[PDB]
Amino acid sequence: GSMRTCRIHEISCGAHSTQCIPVSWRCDGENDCDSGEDEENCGN
Amino acid sequence: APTIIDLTCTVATCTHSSDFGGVLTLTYKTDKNGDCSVHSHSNVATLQEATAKVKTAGKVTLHFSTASASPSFVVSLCSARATCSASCEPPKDHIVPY
């Protein structure tokens, strides 16, 4: 299930990955996460 | 009570101001997760909280306020002990309302 729900303003970087990226890194144009979930479903 | 062994103390930043202008980090080794009552054994520095959460990660943080240029105090965690020493710079604000 959910692994490591991280902190107040993290993204948890995938439900099955142990990574925390700040919210400022979401849809920044860079694949910070290994899975790249941060760049998925961009452009609302 | 959790068993605490090899407790070390380092101070990230210090500034002798009226508000709590100190950050204190404790490293420790534990067997179980519990609650320890944290105290400082001198009036040169005053801690902010009385109890802290000890976890298997091995890092807790405390906030202290001091008025001396270079404090030195003995902080305890459950039954352990350590000696904390730091260098503090003066604050720039002339007057505070508290």
Binding site: - | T13, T15, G21, E89, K92
Partner: protein, 49 residues
């Protein structure tokens, strides 16, 4: 937090200043002179044609 620095008067030079507050993480600014203008003060004497 008062700070002071000296930056060159060269157009396009990417000057960066480092502010290190004792209680906070260091900060880096970026200042740049896009354009400069030197205006004298004139007193007309006469006109010729």
């Amino acid at each position: 937090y008062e700070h002071s620095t000296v930056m060159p008067n060269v157009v396009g030079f990417p000057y960066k200043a480092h502010i290190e507050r004792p209680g906070y993480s260091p900060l880096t600014l970026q200042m740049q002179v896009v354009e400069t203008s030197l205006e004298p003060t004139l007193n007309l004497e006469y006109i010729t044609c």
